[PDB]
Design an enzyme around this catalytic site. Structure first.
Site, PDB file in Angstrom:
ATOM      1  N   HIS A 147      32.633  38.708  45.491  1.00  0.00           N
ATOM      2  CA  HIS A 147      31.307  38.284  45.808  1.00  0.00           C
ATOM      3  C   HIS A 147      30.647  37.615  44.591  1.00  0.00           C
ATOM      4  O   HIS A 147      29.518  37.261  44.658  1.00  0.00           O
ATOM      5  CB  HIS A 147      30.453  39.348  46.486  1.00  0.00           C
ATOM      6  CG  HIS A 147      29.918  40.421  45.586  1.00  0.00           C
ATOM      7  ND1 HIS A 147      29.086  40.165  44.527  1.00  0.00           N
ATOM      8  CD2 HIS A 147      30.026  41.765  45.652  1.00  0.00           C
ATOM      9  CE1 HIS A 147      28.726  41.299  43.965  1.00  0.00           C
ATOM     10  NE2 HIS A 147      29.284  42.284  44.629  1.00  0.00           N
ATOM     11  N   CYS A 166      28.170  45.637  39.153  1.00  0.00           N
ATOM     12  CA  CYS A 166      29.340  45.348  39.949  1.00  0.00           C
ATOM     13  C   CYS A 166      30.573  45.122  39.090  1.00  0.00           C
ATOM     14  O   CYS A 166      30.481  44.586  38.050  1.00  0.00           O
ATOM     15  CB  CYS A 166      29.080  44.182  40.897  1.00  0.00           C
ATOM     16  SG  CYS A 166      27.887  44.520  42.173  1.00  0.00           S
ATOM     17  N   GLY A 169      23.817  44.301  38.259  1.00  0.00           N
ATOM     18  CA  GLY A 169      24.767  43.863  37.242  1.00  0.00           C
ATOM     19  C   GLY A 169      25.930  44.820  37.032  1.00  0.00           C
ATOM     20  O   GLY A 169      26.807  44.559  36.271  1.00  0.00           O
TER      21      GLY A 169
HETATM   22  C1  LIG Z   1      26.182  44.096  41.659  1.00  0.00           C
HETATM   23  O1  LIG Z   1      25.954  43.865  40.492  1.00  0.00           O
HETATM   24  C2  LIG Z   1      25.162  44.817  42.512  1.00  0.00           C
HETATM   25  C3  LIG Z   1      25.421  46.298  42.318  1.00  0.00           C
HETATM   26  C4  LIG Z   1      24.252  47.210  42.387  1.00  0.00           C
HETATM   27  C5  LIG Z   1      22.929  46.891  42.429  1.00  0.00           C
HETATM   28  N1  LIG Z   1      22.254  48.034  42.474  1.00  0.00           N
HETATM   29  C6  LIG Z   1      23.120  49.028  42.447  1.00  0.00           C
HETATM   30  N2  LIG Z   1      24.340  48.529  42.404  1.00  0.00           N
HETATM   31  N3  LIG Z   1      25.368  44.510  43.936  1.00  0.00           N
HETATM   32  C7  LIG Z   1      25.194  43.090  44.265  1.00  0.00           C
HETATM   33  C8  LIG Z   1      24.264  42.966  45.462  1.00  0.00           C
HETATM   34  C9  LIG Z   1      24.934  43.392  46.759  1.00  0.00           C
HETATM   35  C10 LIG Z   1      26.066  42.470  47.123  1.00  0.00           C
HETATM   36  C11 LIG Z   1      26.708  42.880  48.419  1.00  0.00           C
HETATM   37  C12 LIG Z   1      27.787  41.907  48.833  1.00  0.00           C
HETATM   38  C13 LIG Z   1      27.314  40.460  48.864  1.00  0.00           C
HETATM   39  C14 LIG Z   1      26.634  40.097  47.574  1.00  0.00           C
HETATM   40  C15 LIG Z   1      25.540  41.069  47.211  1.00  0.00           C
HETATM   41  C16 LIG Z   1      25.083  40.702  45.831  1.00  0.00           C
HETATM   42  N4  LIG Z   1      23.967  41.543  45.523  1.00  0.00           N
HETATM   43  C17 LIG Z   1      22.771  41.111  45.252  1.00  0.00           C
HETATM   44  O2  LIG Z   1      21.825  41.829  45.248  1.00  0.00           O
HETATM   45  C18 LIG Z   1      22.601  39.667  44.880  1.00  0.00           C
HETATM   46  C19 LIG Z   1      21.486  38.992  45.276  1.00  0.00           C
HETATM   47  C20 LIG Z   1      21.324  37.673  44.917  1.00  0.00           C
HETATM   48  C21 LIG Z   1      22.264  37.032  44.171  1.00  0.00           C
HETATM   49  C22 LIG Z   1      22.011  35.632  43.815  1.00  0.00           C
HETATM   50  C23 LIG Z   1      23.029  34.740  43.644  1.00  0.00           C
HETATM   51  C24 LIG Z   1      22.728  33.442  43.301  1.00  0.00           C
HETATM   52  C25 LIG Z   1      21.422  33.057  43.137  1.00  0.00           C
HETATM   53  C26 LIG Z   1      20.408  33.962  43.303  1.00  0.00           C
HETATM   54  C27 LIG Z   1      20.705  35.252  43.639  1.00  0.00           C
HETATM   55  C28 LIG Z   1      23.388  37.692  43.760  1.00  0.00           C
HETATM   56  C29 LIG Z   1      23.546  39.012  44.121  1.00  0.00           C
END
Ligand SMILES: *C(=O)[C@H](Cc1cnc[nH]1)NC[C@@H]1C[C@H]2CCCC[C@@H]2CN1C(=O)c1ccc(-c2ccccc2)cc1
Ligand SMILES: *C(=O)[C@H](Cc1cnc[nH]1)NC[C@@H]1C[C@H]2CCCC[C@@H]2CN1C(=O)c1ccc(-c2ccccc2)cc1
Lengths: 306, 306
Positions: free
Chosen positions: B41, B145, B143
């Protein structure tokens, strides 16, 4: 989200752990640069200790009375001296994995990570507070002496604890790395008991704040308290009195959450007086006291959930 | 003496942690040999994810679409492929700190150590169980992940978990290092909830045994139970049913203590039925379920206190 007792990553400490043998006694030491530190009781035989004189016991040893091994390399002792309850063994090799480091004497209520070691080999890591009675509720078996406690800031390891012994209640005692004991204990196998302990009020409050940062407000109330009325309640429940200095330290947590310290104090007082009513805070049924305000800020989000 | 949730020493894992950037998304990866593993992802933009097609998203990237940094060295991606929910990035440098290792898919109830990381930089370590609902009660912020979970036996690191996301209850989900999720979750930012969880009966029993090895017998009783009568009580209290296989696994602990499994089962049943009466076991007021039988044997003395 979540809240866990979390240790510092132990690798920089792992690279400093050696085995120190004197006679038939084996225990840990900490190898920094060209010095190995270890408990001075390594030079005792189960007999000597009941009443040791370490000066008289040590003058009887030479450099080659101590064997230091790092992994499977043998390090040669070229010097030795006593410093309070530690030995400093000078060795012929400087540790190439020595991290930036310092030695600190930690204060009661403060927390640190322990690297449990046996025969110079790291086995586990957990987090501990220094209790008010200067003991730690560790997990240690025979051979764990000379395992160290530390904190890591940036790249620098602040060592603060070296393990020396277990007390009859099952709690642990030891020294800073200048060999000064924490508490009124001595490295003699005699009758020695932990004094009465108290709950670390400041930590309780810090953890209440973690719970609000994480999104939970159920135990708050409409009341406030004076510091002094809080303390009469505290003594009744065996909590450390709260001081204006502790109130100050809670400033940043108070500010992130918009809850006044003394308003949190009143929350706490109601909790002590009424109980938790079958409810939990941060997954706990009990009031938790081994997370410092610093530990809460390090672990929790800088943005409060609501 | 003592009993603490104890993590494995994290240094061998620390030496494998890198930072992986695709576009404006940064997250961890695990550098073994000349491969970096990370959540697939990383290639999504907050928009794509609501409904991603990873095949279609990935074919749009080149090797130089990913940046891998280890400390302050830049590693050059020379290959990439998808494996279930991970990317494998081939890099131009083989990790000289790669430990002996393997990948394992851990079973529900089993425990492991998590190295919490941000921007490729390790920040903390704690111990976790895989819940029966295939979530972990971790501590993770944005962050985190690509932070990994592992166990260490001898010198070999068994990796078993890579972090991918947080669920609405605040618990965590992720994959093994073949990129297969634990549980019925998917790497899409959609409505997704943890199913109902159960207490890990086997761990409860293992921990009861730790308490006896450590010298405490107060919760024992004169009774025994059938496995089947135990289970009717278990369902009432939301404990996992006990099986003959779990009974077998408790053999060594049963033998060290001289307490029959099913006699311990009856102890447990009385505890569930009557409560703990204001008392603690191993310092806890509650019945603890995130220490495995293996964890109890690893930590506790091989000689029972009495
Ligand atoms: C990873 O670092 C976090 C882990 C976490 C956060 N809090 C506790 N643990 N997860 C990422 C979170 C959930 C995943 C699920 C699968 C699809 C992607 C999604 C990514 N994500 C986000 O919250 C997220 C939001 C927005 C963006 C973004 C990308 C490009 C431009 C703007 C925003 C990236 C990740
Ligand atoms: C150190 O490894 C252990 C730490 C521990 C054990 N359980 C939990 N934590 N402590 C060593 C223990 C207590 C100290 C106190 C200060 C004087 C020495 C004494 C050493 N000690 C022993 O139990 C001990 C007993 C006997 C011998 C011994 C030496 C020579 C020959 C036979 C026996 C050494 C240590």
């Amino acid at each position: 989200s979540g809240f866990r007792k979390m240790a510092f990553p132990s690798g920089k400490v792992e690279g400093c752990m050696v085995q120190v043998t004197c006679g038939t006694t084996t225990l840990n030491g900490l190898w920094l640069d060209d010095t190995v530190y270890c408990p001075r009781h390594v030079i005792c035989t189960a007999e000597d200790m009941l009443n040791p004189n370490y000066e008289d016991l040590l003058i009887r040893k030479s450099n080659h009375s101590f064997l230091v091994q790092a992994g499977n390399v043998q390090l040669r002792v070229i010097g030795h001296s006593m410093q309070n309850c530690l030995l400093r063994l000078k060795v012929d090799t400087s540790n190439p994995k020595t991290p930036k480091y310092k030695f600190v004497r930690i204060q009661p209520g403060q927390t640190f990570s322990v690297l449990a070691c046996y025969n110079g080999s790291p086995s586990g890591v957990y987090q501990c507070a220094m209790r008010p009675n200067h003991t730690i509720k560790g997990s240690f078996l025979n051979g764990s002496c000379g395992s160290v406690g530390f904190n890591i800031d940036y790249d620098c390891v602040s060592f603060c604890y070296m393990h020396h012994m277990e007390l009859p209640t099952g709690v642990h005692a030891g020294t800073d790395l200048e060999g000064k004991f924490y508490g009124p204990f001595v490295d003699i196998q005699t009758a020695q008991a932990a004094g009465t302990d108290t709950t670390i009020t400041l930590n309780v409050l810090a953890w209440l704040y973690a719970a609000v940062i994480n999104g939970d407000r159920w135990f708050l109330n409409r009341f406030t308290t004076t510091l002094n009325d809080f303390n009469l309640v505290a003594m009744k429940y065996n909590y450390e009195p709260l001081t204006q200095d502790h109130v100050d330290i809670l400033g940043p947590l108070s500010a992130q959450t918009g809850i006044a310290v003394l308003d949190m104090c009143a929350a706490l007082k109601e909790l002590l007086q009424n109980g938790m009513n079958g409810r939990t805070i941060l997954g706990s049924t009990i009031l938790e006291d081994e997370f410092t305000p610093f530990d809460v800020v390090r672990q929790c989000s800088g943005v409060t959930f609501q």
